[PDB]
Amino acid sequence: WQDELTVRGLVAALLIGFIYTVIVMKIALTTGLVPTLNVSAALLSFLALRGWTRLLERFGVVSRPFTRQENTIVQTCGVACYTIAFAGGFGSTLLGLNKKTYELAGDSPGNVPGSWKEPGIGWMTGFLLACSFGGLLTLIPLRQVLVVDYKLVYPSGTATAILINGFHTDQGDKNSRKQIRGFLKYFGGSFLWSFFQWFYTGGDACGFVQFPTFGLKAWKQTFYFDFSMTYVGAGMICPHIVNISTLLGAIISWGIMWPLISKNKGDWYPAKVPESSMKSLYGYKAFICIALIMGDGMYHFIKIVGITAMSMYRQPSWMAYAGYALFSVLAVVTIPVMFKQVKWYYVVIAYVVAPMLGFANSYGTGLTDINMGYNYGKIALFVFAGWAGKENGVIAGLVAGTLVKQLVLISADLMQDFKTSYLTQTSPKSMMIAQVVGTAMGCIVSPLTFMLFYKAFDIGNPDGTWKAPYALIYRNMAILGVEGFSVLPKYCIVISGGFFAFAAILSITRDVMPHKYAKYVPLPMAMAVPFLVGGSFAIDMCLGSLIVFAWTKINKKEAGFMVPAVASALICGDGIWTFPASILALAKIKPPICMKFLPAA
Amino acid sequence: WQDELTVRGLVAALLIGFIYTVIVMKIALTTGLVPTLNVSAALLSFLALRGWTRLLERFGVVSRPFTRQENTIVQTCGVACYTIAFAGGFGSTLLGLNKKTYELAGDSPGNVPGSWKEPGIGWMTGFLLACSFGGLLTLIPLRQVLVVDYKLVYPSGTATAILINGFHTDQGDKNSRKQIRGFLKYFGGSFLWSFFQWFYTGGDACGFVQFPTFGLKAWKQTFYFDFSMTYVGAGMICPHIVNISTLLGAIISWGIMWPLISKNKGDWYPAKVPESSMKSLYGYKAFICIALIMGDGMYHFIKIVGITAMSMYRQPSWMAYAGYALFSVLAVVTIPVMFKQVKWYYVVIAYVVAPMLGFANSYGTGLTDINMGYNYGKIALFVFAGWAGKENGVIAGLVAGTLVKQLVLISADLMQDFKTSYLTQTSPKSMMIAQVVGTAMGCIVSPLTFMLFYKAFDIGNPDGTWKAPYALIYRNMAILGVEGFSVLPKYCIVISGGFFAFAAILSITRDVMPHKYAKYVPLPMAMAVPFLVGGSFAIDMCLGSLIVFAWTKINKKEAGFMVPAVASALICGDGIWTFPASILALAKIKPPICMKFLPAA
Ligand SMILES: CC(C)CCC[C@@H](C)[C@H]1CC[C@H]2[C@@H]3CC=C4C[C@@H](OC(=O)CCC(=O)O)CC[C@]4(C)[C@H]3CC[C@]12C
Ligand SMILES: CC(C)CCC[C@@H](C)[C@H]1CC[C@H]2[C@@H]3CC=C4C[C@@H](OC(=O)CCC(=O)O)CC[C@]4(C)[C@H]3CC[C@]12C
Ligand SMILES: CC(C)CCC[C@@H](C)[C@H]1CC[C@H]2[C@@H]3CC=C4C[C@@H](OC(=O)CCC(=O)O)CC[C@]4(C)[C@H]3CC[C@]12C
Ligand SMILES: CC(C)CCC[C@@H](C)[C@H]1CC[C@H]2[C@@H]3CC=C4C[C@@H](OC(=O)CCC(=O)O)CC[C@]4(C)[C@H]3CC[C@]12C
Ligand SMILES: O=C(O)[C@H](CCN1CC[C@H]1C(=O)O)NCC[C@H](O)C(=O)O
Ligand SMILES: O=C(O)[C@H](CCN1CC[C@H]1C(=O)O)NCC[C@H](O)C(=O)O
Ligand SMILES: [Fe+3]
Ligand SMILES: [Fe+3]
C-alpha cells in the first residue's frame, strides 16, 4: 500500500520510460531491430533512486529507505512505458499506414488508393488508450495460474528478481555472501565478454554470434553455437525437458522438414517469390509454428476453463473480466470511428481470442523465455486481411494485427514482471497500479516521442538514414493477405492441421500417463520456438542444461543454490551490455572489424 | 648405470626416431614449417614401453619395471635422432646445394656454374658424423653452469619432466593426487582447445592464431594476442623480469624502431627489393637481434671464463674439451675434402666460435624457451659467404652456415633434455650415452630417409607437391652474401653496434648494482627475441605472468605447487596435439574453414 508506491518512483519511472522510449523509437525507425532492455531498466532504476537518496543525505535532507519492493515497482512502471513504443507497432504497423509506405509498395490489387492514414498525436494517443489496457486486465486471472500454479519459470523475470534482491540484501549469512560474490564474478565476465564481442560484429552475419562451431554446412541450417550467455543462462534454470524439447523441435523442423519441403521449390510454391514470404516456405514456418502452439495452447486453456467450470458447479476473478469487457466495448465503438475500413465485429473477434492468444504467449514465455507476440500479429494481420476484399483490406489487416499483437505481447512481457514481484515479495495490487500508470504514461509519451522524430526527420526513405524496413515489410504482408488462404504454399494447411493434432496428442499424453512416464513427454510449444528461430537457440539452451547436469553430479549441494545466481549473472551481464550497445548504435558508432568465416577459399 | 640404459629403450628410441624423422622430413620438404615434437615423443615413449611391458605380462613374460629414468633416456635418445633431420639443413641448406636449386636461382654474380653438389648417402652421412658430435661435447661444461648454477628454467624441459613424473608417480599423497588431477583437467582442455582451433586455420593468416585482439592496425604490427597456451604456459613458470623484458623488447622494436626505420624505404635501403631480405629492413632485424644477444652473451661467457681463470690461479671439465678438439680436427681435415670450395680455416673459425655461439643460444632457450639456432645459421651463412668471392662463395656460405647452425641448435635443444633429467633424477652420464646413440642413429637414419624421399619423388619443384621453399630462400641468402657487408641497409652496422653496447651495459648494470635494485634491470637477450618474432609472443608471455601474479595474490599456498602443473598441462596439451596435426598435414587433410578478420568492408 505504501513504501512501494512513491512519488520519487513515479518521477524515476517517468524519466527511465522517456529515455528508453527515445532509444527504442530511434532504433525502431532506423533498423527495426529493437533489443531487450528490461534488465537494464532494473539497474538504472537502482542507480537513479540510490543516487537521489545519497545526494539528499549529502545535502542534509532525510528520505525514506529505498527497498527492493520499490525498485520492483519503478522497474515495472518504466518497462510498461517504453514497451508501448515497440509493442504499439510504431515502426512496423502504424508506420505502414503512411502514404509514403503506400507509395513504396506500388500499384497492386489490394493496395487500393484509399489505404493510407497519416500519423497524428490525436488519433495515435486515442488508439493506444482504448486498446493498451485490454492486456492488463487479462493478467489478473492469468497471474495465479501461470506464475505460481503452473510454476512456470520466467528466466528473464527470475534473473531480474535475483539482480534486484542482490542490490537490496543487507544480511550477512553463510550463503548470502557466496551468492553475491559468485554473481559478481560471472556478471563482470559476461558483461566483458559481450563488450569484447561487439568489436567483431561489424558486418552482415559475422562475429562470435555467427560462429560455425559444427561447420559451414550446419551453420546455414542454423545448427551452430552462438556464444550467447543469455540463452546459456536461460537453459541453466529451465528444466531439462524444456531444453530437450527445444532441441527436438529444431531437429524436426530444420533438420528434417525444411530440407524436405524445400525440395519442391517449383512444384509446391513459386521459386521466383523470395523466401520469408507467406507464399514461399515461410507459410510453412509461421503456420506450423502457431499450430503447434495453438494445439498445445487450446488444450491447456480448455483445461483451466473445465476445472473452473466443475468447481463452480460443485459449489476478484470476475472483477477483472468485467473490467476487460468494459474496455472491450470502448474499443469496439471507438476504433471503427478512426478507421472506417475496420468493422465493429473485427474488433469483437480480436478481443475474444485475445484471452486465448495471450495465454499461449505467456505460457510460452514462461517456458523458453521467448516472447512470440510479434509472430501472432503477423498471423492475425494475414488472417484479418483475408477477411476483407481488395477494398478496406490492407488497413483492416494492419490495424487488427496491431490490436492482436499488443494484447498478446503485453501479456507475456508483463508476466515477467509478476515473476519478479513474486520473488521480491512485492504486493500484486501495487504491481497492477504500476502497470496502469506506466501504460498510461506510455500511451502519451510514445505518440509525442514518435511525432517529434516524425516531424523533424524523414522516416521511411529506403535510401536514407531513417529507414523503417519493417513498415514496408508489414505493408506487403497485408497486400499479400488480401488474397485469401489460396496464396499459402501447397499442403500448408494440411501439415499445419496435422501438427495441430500432434501437439494436442502430446498434451493429452502427458496429463493422462503416470508421472513416472509423464516426465519424458516433450512439450509441444517449447518445440515450436525453433521453427522460426534457428537451432542455435536450442543448442545454447541444451548447453546450459548440460552445465547444470554436470554441476549437479559433481556437487549436489552447491549446485542447488549457486545455479540460479550464476545463470542470472550470465543473463544480466549480456542484458546490461545492451544499454551501452544501444547508445553506440544511437550515435552511429559501428563495430570496426568483421569476423567472417569462409570455406578455405 | 643400469635400469636406465636398456635394450627395449634402444629399440623403442630407434622406432620413435624413425617415424619422427619421416614426419619431419616430409614436412620439411613440402612446407619447411617443421613443428616442435619433443613433448609428443615423451608420450609415445611412455605408451610404447608400457604397452610392451603389459603385453608381455599378458603372454606370461616377466620384464623389468619401466621407471621414469628409463622414460627420460628413451625420449632423449629419440629426440636426438630426428633433430638431425631438421637441424642438419636437409630441407634448407643441404638441399640448396642441388643443381635444381642452382638453376632456380638463375644467372647472377656469386652463382657461378660450379656452385652445386648432388645428394648422396656416402657424403651426407660422413658430413653428419664429423660435425654432429661437436655440439654434444660442449654440453658437458655448459650443463653445470646453465641448468643448476644459473638456475635457468627451460619451460619445455620443465613441462616434459612434470609430464614424465606424473606418468610414473605411484605414491598417494595429500598433494600428489591434486597435482595429477589439476594437470589432467588443463591438459585435456588445452588439447581440445588446440584441436578445435585446427578447423579454422584453413588459410594464410586466419584463425584464432591470427586474432586481432587489439585491432587490425595493431595486428599488422604484430601486437595481438594469439590464443597459444604454449606461450601462456611458458610465461607462467618464467620469472616476471623475463616476461617484462620480452614485452619491453617488443615495444622498442616493433612499436618504435621498425616504423621509424621503415620511413626511409627509399633512402636507406632500396624499395624494389622485398622485405625479409638482408638488403631491406631485415638486415636491421637480424643484425640488431644478434648484437643484443651477442652483447649480453659475450659479457656472460667472459664472466665464466674469468671466474674459472681466477679459480685455477688461486689453486671431467677438460676431458670434454679435449674430446671436442679431437672432433674439431676431424672435421677440419674432412669437410674440405667433400667441399673443395670450403677452406680449412673456415672450419677452424666455425669450431672456435661454436662454444661461444652455443652458449648464448642455450642461455636464450633457458630464459624464453625459444631456440634461435636457425637464426644464427643465417648470420653465419651471410658472413661466411662474404668471406669468399664470387668463386666458391655460395657453397662456402651454405656449408659453413650448416656447421654453425648444428652446433648452436643442438646445444639448445638438448639442454632442454638435461633440465628434464635434472628434475627426474636421471644420471647425467647415462644421459650423455643416450645423446651419442641417438645422434649416431640420426646421422644414419636421416640421410637414408632423405634419399628415399629424394629418389622416389621430385623435391624442389616450385610448381608441385614436394616443394622445398627454404632451399631456394637459403640459396638466395648465400648469393646475396657473396657481396660483402656493403649490401646491408644504411646505418645497419652503426645501430647494431649501438645495441651491442647497450646490451653489454645492461649486463654490467645488473651484476654491479645491489640485488635490491638489480632485480628491475631488463634482460637484454630476452628483449632480443621479439625482434624477429612479433610482439604476440611477448603478450602471451606477459599474460601468463599476469595469471601467476593474480593467483599468488589470491592464494599464496596453492599457487606455490599448482602453477608448474597447470603451466605444464597447457604446454603439453598444445604440444601433444602437434602429433595428430602433423599426421593430418602428412596425409594432406587441410582445415575446412578460414576465420578471416576484415575492416568492416
Ligand atoms: C569433446 C567435445 C568438446 C566435442 C567438440 C565438438 C566437435 C564434435 C565439433 C567441433 C569442431 C567440429 C567440426 C568443425 C568444422 C567442420 C567443418 C565442416 O566442413 C565444412 O562444411 C566447412 C565448409 C567447407 O569446407 O565447405 C564439416 C564438419 C566439421 C569437421 C565439424 C565436425 C564436428 C566438430 C569436430
Ligand atoms: C549436446 C548439445 C550441446 C547440442 C549438440 C548438438 C550437435 C552436436 C548436433 C545435434 C543435432 C545435429 C544436427 C542434426 C541435423 C542436421 C540436419 C542436416 O541437414 C541437412 O540435411 C542439410 C539440408 C540441405 O542440404 O539443405 C545436417 C546435419 C545437422 C545440421 C546436424 C549437425 C550437428 C547437430 C547440431
Ligand atoms: C578489461 C580487459 C579485459 C580489457 C580488454 C582489452 C581492451 C583494452 C581491448 C579489447 C578490444 C580492443 C579493441 C578491439 C578493436 C579495435 C579496433 C581498432 O580499429 C581497427 O583498426 C579495426 C580495423 C579498421 O577499422 O580499419 C581500434 C582499437 C580497438 C577499438 C581495440 C582497443 C582495445 C580493446 C578495447
Ligand atoms: C598486459 C599484457 C597482457 C599485454 C597488453 C599490452 C597491450 C594492452 C598494449 C601494450 C603495448 C601496446 C602497443 C605499443 C605500441 C604500439 C605501436 C604503434 O605502432 C605504430 O606506431 C604503427 C606504425 C605504422 O604506422 O606502421 C601502434 C600501437 C601499438 C601497437 C600498441 C598496441 C597495444 C599494446 C600491444
Ligand atoms: O516487430 C517486428 O517484426 C520487428 C522485429 C521484432 N520486434 C523487435 C522487437 C520485436 C517485437 O516487436 O516484439 N520490429 C519492427 C519494429 C518494431 O519492433 C515494431 O514492431 O514496431
Ligand atoms: O630453418 C628454417 O629457417 C626453416 C624454418 C625454421 N625451422 C623449422 C624448425 C626451424 C629450425 O630449423 O630449427 N626450416 C626450413 C626447413 C628445415 O627446418 C631445415 O632447416 O632444414
Ligand atoms: Fe517489433
Ligand atoms: Fe629449419
Task: Tell me how far the alpha carbon of residue B372 lies from the centroid of ligand 8, in angstroms.
Answer: 10
Contact predicate B458/B464, CB 8 Å: yes
Q: How far apart are CA A487 and CA A386, in angstroms?
A: 10
A252 C-beta closer than 6 A to ligand 2 = no
Task: Tell me how far the alpha carbon of residue A84 lies from the centroid of ligand 5, in angstroms.
Answer: 11
Ligand with the closest atom to the CA of A91: 5
- Assess B227–A contact: CB distance below 8 Å, yes or no: no
Contact A599 B591 (CB under 8 A): no
Q: How far apart are CA B223 and CA B212, in angstroms?
A: 8
Name which of B591, B594, B597 is nearest A593 (Cβ-Cβ). B597
What count of residues does chain B have? 601
B339 C-beta closer than 6 A to ligand 6 = no
What count of residues does chain A have? 601
* A positions 197-226 inside 8 Å of B (CB): 199-200, 202-203, 212, 215-216
Q: How far apart are CA B4 and CA B6, in angstroms?
A: 6
* Secondary structure (H, E, C), A40-94: HHHHHHHHHHHHHHHHHHHCCCCCCCCCHHHHHHHHHHHHHHHHHHHHCCCCCCH
Contact predicate A369/A362, CB 8 Å: no
B28 C-beta closer than 6 A to ligand 6 = yes
- Assess A185–B contact: CB distance below 8 Å, yes or no: no
Does the residue B573 lie in any domain? Answer: yes
User: What domain range includes position A381?
Assistant: 7-315+324-586
Q: How far apart are CA B589 and CA B601, in angstroms?
A: 31
Q: Which residues pair with A280 in a beta bridge?
A: A277
Contact predicate B568/B423, CB 8 Å: no
B24 C-beta closer than 6 A to ligand 6 = no
Compute the nearest-CA separation of B196 from chain A (Å). 9
DSSP at A529? G
Residues of A in contact with B598 (CB under 8 A): 203, 593-594, 596
For residue B484, how many other CB atoms are within 10 A of its CB?
A: 13
- Assess B150–A contact: CB distance below 8 Å, yes or no: no
Contact B215 A592 (CB under 8 A): yes
Does the residue A476 lie in any domain? Answer: yes
Output the nine-digit C-alpha cell for B541: 608471455
What 3-state class would DSSP assign to B88? coil
Name which of A203, A212, A592 is nearest B593 (Cβ-Cβ). A212
Amino acid identity of residue B18, one-letter, is F
DSSP at B251? I
Does the residue A2 lie in any domain? Answer: no
Nearest residue by C-alpha to atom 30 in ligand 4: B218
Please state how this structure was obtained.
cryo-EM
- Assess A62–B contact: CB distance below 8 Å, yes or no: no
Output the nine-digit C-alpha cell for A192: 566483458
Ligand with the closest atom to the CA of B374: 6
| Nearest C-alpha neighbor of B459 from the set B92, B171, B211, B146 | B92
DSSP characters for B536-601? HHHHHHHHHHHHHHHHHHH-HHHHHHHHHHHHHHHHHHHHHHHHHHHHHHHTT---S-EEEEES--
Contact A597 B597 (CB under 8 A): no
Contact predicate A427/A2, CB 8 Å: no
Helix residue ranges, H only, B216-281: 216-220, 229-236, 240-250, 258-261
B284 C-beta closer than 6 A to ligand 4 = no
Helix pair B38-58, B68-87: axis angle to 10 deg: 130
Residues of A in contact with B597 (CB under 8 A): 200, 593-596
For residue B307, how many other CB atoms are within 10 A of its CB?
A: 10
C-beta contacts of B545-554 below 8 A and 24+ residues apart: B545/B235, B545/B236, B545/B238, B545/B240, B545/B243, B545/B244, B547/B232, B547/B236, B548/B235, B548/B236, B548/B240, B549/B240
Name which of A203, A216, A591 is nearest B593 (Cβ-Cβ). A216
CA B270 → CA A176, B262, B489, distances in Å? 69, 11, 8
- Assess B598–A contact: CB distance below 8 Å, yes or no: yes
| Nearest C-alpha neighbor of A34 from the set A582, A583, A588, A587 | A582
Does the residue B445 lie in any domain? Answer: yes
* A positions 34-53 inside 8 Å of B (CB): none
DSSP at A206? -
∠ CA B181-B185-B186, nearest 5°, is: 120
Helix residue ranges, H only, A315-343: 317-338
| Nearest C-alpha neighbor of B95 from the set B124, B73, B122 | B124
Does the residue B409 lie in any domain? Answer: yes
A239 C-beta closer than 6 A to ligand 2 = no
Does the residue B457 lie in any domain? Answer: yes
| Nearest C-alpha neighbor of A498 from the set A194, A277, A284, A227 | A284
What 3-state class would DSSP assign to A597? strand
Contact predicate A472/A104, CB 8 Å: yes
Compute the nearest-CA separation of B537 from chain A (Å). 21
Compute the nearest-CA separation of B220 from chain A (Å). 14
| Nearest C-alpha neighbor of B24 from the set B12, B6, B37 | B37
Does the residue A593 lie in any domain? Answer: no
Contact predicate A343/A217, CB 8 Å: no
B214 C-beta closer than 6 A to ligand 4 = yes
Pocket test for ligand 6, best of B21, B34, B405 (most atoms within 8 A of CB): B34
Contact A599 B592 (CB under 8 A): yes
A32 C-beta closer than 6 A to ligand 5 = yes
Amino acid identity of residue A531, one-letter, is F
Residues of A in contact with B203 (CB under 8 A): 598, 600-601
Name which of B202, B590, B596 is nearest A596 (Cβ-Cβ). B596
Does the residue A595 lie in any domain? Answer: no
Output the nine-digit C-alpha cell for A435: 502497470
DSSP at B522? P
Amino acid identity of residue A482, one-letter, is V
Q: What is the resolution of this structure in A?
A: 2.7
Burial class (CB in 10 A: 0-12, 13-18, 19+), B314: exposed
- Number of structural domains, chain A? 1
Q: B214: nearest CA in chain A?
A: A199
Categorise residue A207: left if φ over 0, alpha if ψ from -120 to 50, beta otherwise: left
Q: State which ligand 4 atom lies nearest to the alpha carbon of B220.
A: 26
